[PDB]
UniProtKB/Swiss-Prot annotation:
It is found in: Cytoplasm. Heat-shock protein cognate (HSC) co-chaperone that preferentially binds endoplasmic reticulum-destined tail-anchored (TA) proteins and directs them to the GET (guided entry of TA proteins) pathway via get4 and get5. Get4 and get5 form an obligate complex that catalyzes the transfer of tail-anchored proteins destined to the endoplasmic reticulum from sgt2 to the cytosolic targeting factor which then targets the TA protein to the ER membrane via get1/get2. The tetratrico-repeat (TPR) region has the ability to directly bind multiple HSC family members including ssa1, sse1, hsp104 and hsc82. The chain holds residues 109 to 254 of 341 of the full protein. Forms homodimers. Component of the get4/get5/sgt2 sorting complex. Dimers of sgt2 bind directly a single get5. Binds HSC family members ssa1, sse1, hsp104 and hsc82 via its TPR domain. The keyword Membrane does not apply. GO terms for biological process: post-translational protein targeting to endoplasmic reticulum membrane; response to heat. Its main location: cytoplasm. Changing R84A: Impairs binding to HSC proteins. TPR repeats lie at residues 11-44, 45-78, 79-112. Belongs to the SGT family. One of its GO terms (molecular function) is protein serine/threonine phosphatase activity. The gene is sgt12. One of its GO terms (cellular component) is TRC complex. This is Heat-shock protein cognate (HSC) co-chaperone sgt12.
Length: 151
């Protein structure tokens, strides 16, 4: 018969084994274990957001972003997915997109945001303001005054 396409004790075991792999910093294994969980329950936002964390830890920001995005599409009310998406976009230097993700995460979280979301949004805004105001100070003009004018 057909699978239920929803989480099972088996998929959750795989998720837990994935979580343990993360703890050991075995990111490639975590990615594989979360993927196995997702083969049982496709597009599960918890499993997706966990695999996103593993991608991010291993420096694979585009893959992290795709997992996190899909999670936010499936469950836009799941604040953790937005936090994952924010970090992934931040790490891709997509600061506008990171700002948007953190803002939506903060709304979904329903309590002003997790510490990570609040700091994430603050840091992203500061980066955007740095760019807007100029990342480099202006230089003052060279002096055309006479050398003895300071005397």
């Amino acid at each position: 018969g057909p699978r239920s396409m929803a989480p099972t004790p088996e998929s959750d075991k795989l998720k837990s084994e994935g979580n343990a792999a993360m703890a050991r910093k075995e990111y490639s294994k975590a990615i594989d274990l979360y993927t196995q969980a997702l083969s049982i329950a496709p597009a599960n936002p918890i499993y997706l957001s966990n695999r996103a964390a593993a991608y991010s830890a291993s420096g694979q920001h585009e893959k992290a972003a795709e997992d996190a995005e899909l999670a936010t599409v499936v469950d836009p009310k799941y604040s953790k997915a937005w936090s994952r998406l924010g970090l992934a976009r931040f790490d891709m230097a997509d600061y506008k997109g990171a700002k948007e993700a953190y803002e939506k995460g903060i709304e979904a979280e329903g309590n002003g945001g997790s510490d990570a979301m609040k700091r994430g949004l603050e840091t992203t805004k500061r980066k955007i303001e740095e760019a807007n105001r100029g990342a480099e100070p202006p230089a003052d003009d060279v002096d055309d005054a006479a050398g003895a004018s300071r005397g």
